[PDB]
Design a binder for this molecule. Structure first.
Ligand code: LHR
Length: 435
């Protein structure tokens, strides 16, 4: 498994022990063979869990999520998927790791897809070995894989709005439920309806994940309302999963704007990962999985695969060569390899708009490729009237860095900058020149 020129997919079912049992064995063998190794965690929460399973082993934690004193002699590095891709893009020397281990390798965020493409290209070239750890490899068609204990699967209508009647089974439950919703806004409505009925609810999403996940272990709760981020190795002490079976899909229209389409069906991989939250304790059979729709291959034409190509086109590999996407997920986008390659100055602006600007990859690319510098925000206000960003049914307004009140009307409209109150707040600060 650790021999050069080989990519292995460790596809044990959810809860089979990939992270707590297999991962330490692989690390011990890699250190014995003196292989310079990278361990890639999807989130800071998973990085903290990996430190518990690897505790004592000489691993260098390149994250502030772990408070450890490194000896300086570690040959095994651990960092998040995004950090790896970020360091590849930046003018920082990244070691040419002999062994590349990716945990939760089904993660479909652009930086995870780009990391898989880069690593799999190095393996194809015969320069490295790689191990992708996931119960649901790219292309899986089984939404009901094996579990540690039997699960009661039930197809049922699941509410996506507040309800006054017709869903007694939801509140007539004395255990703990994890509920996957298609968006932050949809979760807010269900959480308020559940709170009004006397339930204690915790809400999780990409931006609030590390802080709010702590509350699932520090306090008593009845429901966790979460977006698709909890498919990435997040574990709960629950006995029921309610799954809407729906997600939002970013879609690029005519190469000029990004909309959040749907809600629409999740992939079979996503459904299996959501269901996989329960049935994990062999001593507690009977966990329930209630699902509200079917699965579909909605990753085809999803903006994240296009954004992954924008990232890989700007990562140095060898001379003019460019890393391809990982073969099983390469048909999800119809881009020309190298079509997003930027010149040195524009590439630096592209990186900074993502790293400091916190802009989506697609939007960062439109700005940098237009020859606009990082601190130049005139583009946030000179778009067409149909690009007006709306806040509570009235045009959003900001004071520019010049002291003038202006309506937010970006030249390129990416729906992810205003998909929720928190996102629009961060975009307003960016348009105002506050970061
Ligand atoms: C993959 C493909 O269809 N090409 C494409 C799609 C959308 C955009 C937006 N900006 N550049 C683009 C290039």
């Amino acid at each position: 498994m650790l021999k050069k020129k080989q990519l292995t997919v460790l596809d044990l079912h959810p809860g089979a022990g990939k992270t707590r049992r297999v991962l330490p064995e692989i690390v011990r063998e890699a250190i014995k063979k003196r292989l310079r190794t990278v361990i890639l965690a999807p989130t800071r929460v998973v990085a903290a869990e990996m430190e518990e399973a690897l505790r004592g082993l000489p691993v260098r934690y390149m994250t502030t999520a772990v408070n450890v004193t490194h000896s300086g002699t570690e040959i095994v590095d651990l960092m998040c998927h995004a950090t790896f891709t970020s360091r590849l893009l930046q003018p920082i020397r990244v070691p040419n790791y002999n062994l590349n281990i990716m945990d939760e390798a089904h993660f479909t965020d652009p930086s995870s897809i780009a990391a898989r493409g880069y690593i799999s290209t190095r393996v194809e070239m015969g320069e490295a070995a790689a191990i992708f750890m996931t119960a649901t490899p790219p292309g899986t068609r089984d939404a009901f894989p094996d579990s540690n204990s039997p699960i009661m699967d039930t197809e049922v209508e699941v509410p996506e709005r507040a309800w006054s009647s017709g869903f007694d089974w939801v509140t007539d439950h004395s255990g703990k439920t994890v509920w996957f919703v298609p968006s932050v806004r949809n979760g807010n409505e269900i959480a308020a309806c559940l709170t009004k009925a006397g339930k204690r609810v915790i809400q999780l999403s990409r931006k609030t994940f590390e802080t709010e996940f702590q509350k699932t272990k520090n306090q008593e709760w009845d429901f966790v309302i979460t977006t698709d981020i909890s498919e990435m190795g997040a574990n709960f002490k629950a006995d029921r999963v309610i799954d809407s079976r729906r997600c939002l899909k970013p879609v690029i229209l005519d190469g000029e704007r990004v909309i959040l389409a749907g809600p629409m069906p999740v992939t079979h991989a996503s459904a299996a990962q959501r269901r996989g939250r329960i049935g994990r304790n062999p001593n507690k059979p009977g966990d329930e999985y209630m699902y509200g729709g079917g699965c579909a291959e909605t990753d085809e034409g999803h903006a994240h695969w296009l954004e992954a190509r924008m990232l890989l086109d700007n990562i140095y590999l060898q001379d003019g060569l460019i890393a391809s996407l990982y073969r099983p997920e390469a048909d999800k986008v119809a881009a020309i390899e190298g079509e997003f390659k930027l010149r040195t100055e524009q590439r630096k602006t592209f990186v900074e708009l993502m790293k400091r600007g916190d802009l989506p990859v697609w939007l960062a690319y439109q700005v940098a490729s237009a020859g606009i510098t990082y601190t130049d925000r005139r583009w946030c206000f000179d778009g067409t009237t149909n690009n007006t960003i709306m806040e509570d049914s009235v045009p959003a307004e900001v004071w520019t860095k010049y002291g003038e009140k202006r309506v937010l009307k970006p030249r390129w409209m990416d729906a992810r900058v205003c998909s929720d109150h928190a996102a629009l707040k961060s975009f307003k600060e960016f348009a105002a020149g506050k970061r």
